[model samples]
Target chain A: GSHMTEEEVRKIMEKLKKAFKQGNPEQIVSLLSPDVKVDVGNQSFSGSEEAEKAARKLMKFVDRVEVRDVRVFENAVMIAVEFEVNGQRYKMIFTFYVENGKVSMVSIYISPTMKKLMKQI
Target chain B: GSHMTEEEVRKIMEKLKKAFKQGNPEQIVSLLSPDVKVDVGNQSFSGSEEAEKAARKLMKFVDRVEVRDVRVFENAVMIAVEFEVNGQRYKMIFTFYVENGKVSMVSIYISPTMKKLMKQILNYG
Candidate 1:
């Protein structure tokens, strides 16, 4: 299978990070597939409609986020990010799947180990 | 989401390990969805057709494979394994997704780090 060069994948990730910086779900969803599945917390949404809604609900608080690490896989990319929302911080793993130059699916989780890694409590 | 209980998930993983141990790909694919996507070595196959073929191809050459560790998630599970084939070895990470009490998707990779972490190569050789 012909996969995207790491550069191509990184460029796409940059666009996603930019959208995150702007806190704009519309721009983010636009770069994804119509039937995209995205997860926040334990909730997974299908299609752009629910995904956009989910993004809007979470990002509207406007505190900002940071990427702690990224590991690229053959068919996906994963990132561990530190998210600060409404004064409390959460670390989440974001997994991305790219298809035909568009984001097809994304899954994120706030695992227990991530919480334990930070000294917030 | 009412995801599978961790106990239920581990039981399913047990079936997969059994299938792998027996070198029978059909036993494994039977537990997955008809349109399940499974990836290995940069090749991603959709549905049981290609996955069955891939499994057959690899397991035929595998002498044995061992699970190093596994981490479960809300919707999926990830595993690292040490595999031996024809006196050569490969390390792979297997990611699994469960849907409707069945395996839906699996992705695997033989990452370079998995190779470096193996003290067998440096110590034994």
Candidate 2:
């Protein structure tokens, strides 16, 4: 069992942010654990391959990603982020479950506006 | 420090919801500890008297209150609530600090729409 320091967690988060901003799906995929699961609304994607595929689909239309705030707790982190795609700003909350010094699971809650946008496409 | 069970916390939250829905300022004020401090936007009120006074001002315009969800962690609880006043729905997040089985402090974050509404009343009017 490896205990992750706050500094280490921040570094990893920085890398994730950079990858998200650059729209680098591969780099983002590398950060996620092999058994990672992503939950957004009613949709669930398990395993890094499936999660990356889902993320790539979003990256295709997203013009920019901005992380508004990050809150770190004992073994979890919550990030407030927004995505601008096709002239619409979508707000989202990402809650990460950290285990063995890496992000193992992510639960996302999207705003009503984002949900409506996704439904249109 | 009395350790509050999840059930107890839920009951307190339910009471809060009821008080809010009833628009009973006195009951809501009674639930808060004497030394309560409330932070909403840039305005801060300390003590039950001041807090109740501020709440009364808001009560005049508010039509309905709804508690969307409540999340409890340790000694703190976060609530997602919406207030309908006039013809607008205002979203808000309330973070409560509980001590001795009572609410000690509360920090509220209002959405942009709510802020704009308040600004119109406070500044524009």
Candidate 3:
């Protein structure tokens, strides 16, 4: 397997964003590893099955999603994205752990302000 | 060599947060490499000595600090912390680049809200 190039990283990120916006559970699950972990606000979910469940729940309320910034590191990539849900904007950061050019794990952190904003809307 | 355990990483992160609270230049410098670099807001600072000088200057008004959350990864760590000074709170995120159990580089991002708050307090000096 080859190391992920910058262009490859960009493409993956874009695809992830597209999947998120379209609320495609299968596509989203395909991009994630079996044991993917997602941390949002004060809650966290582990494993692809759990993450997919959570994603479906989130998709019900989300209107659109946007990827703002992405930073590619040696072994991981940090992404900042915004979501429009119920007429409110929420921002979140997701750190992707990649192994052998595929995502293996993910950790997410969303700001309190954004959380409150989403809750209000 | 043993891989860094979660406990060790937590301890290191606590120490770093404490150093920032105390504004101890020596202690902070001791935790970093000579080539350390700091990224904050839209600007970045490089080198331990340079970071030290900058810290000394910032120590003037910062009264209290709090660590919000810390996440440890295989090769890096992400930290979220708050600073209270002159009746205002500043939130920041820092990405630490670690090598050989020591910090080599630091990338920081401060919120625009906090930046505006600081500017109002400092009056843009």
Q: How much of the real interface does each model capture, measured as fnat?
A: 0.00, 0.00, 0.00
**Every model's DockQ, to 2 decimals?**
0.06, 0.03, 0.04
DockQ of model 1, rounded to 2 decimals: 0.06
Task: Please say which candidate is ahead in TM-score: 1 or 3.
Answer: 1
* C-alpha lDDT of candidate 1 relative to the true structure: 0.63
lDDT of 3 by residue, A13-104 (tens): 66666665565656757787776655454455668888877777776777887866666554456766777776878766666655454565
| Chain A, model 3: TM | 0.72
- For model 1 the local lDDT of residue B88 reads 72
**How high a TM-score does candidate 1 get?**
0.48
Stretches off by above 4 angstroms in model 1 are A1-121, B112-125
Residue B114 lDDT, candidate 1, scale 0-100: 38
Docking class of 1: incorrect
Q: Give all TM-scores, in the order shown.
A: 0.48, 0.48, 0.47
lDDT of 3 by residue, B8-119 (tens): 7666777776776565657767777787656443334668887776666566667777777666654457766777768887766666656556676665545446656544
Give DockQ: model 2.
0.03
lDDT of 2 by residue, B37-73 (tens): 6766445667888777777778777788887766664
Local accuracy of candidate 1 as per-residue lDDT tens digits, A55-82 = 6666665376876666555446666666
In model 2, the runs with Cα more than 4 Å from the true position are A1-121, B119-125
lDDT measured at residue A58 in model 1 versus the true structure, 0 to 100: 62
Residue A117 of model 2, lDDT score: 72
TM-score of chain A of each: 0.73, 0.81, 0.72
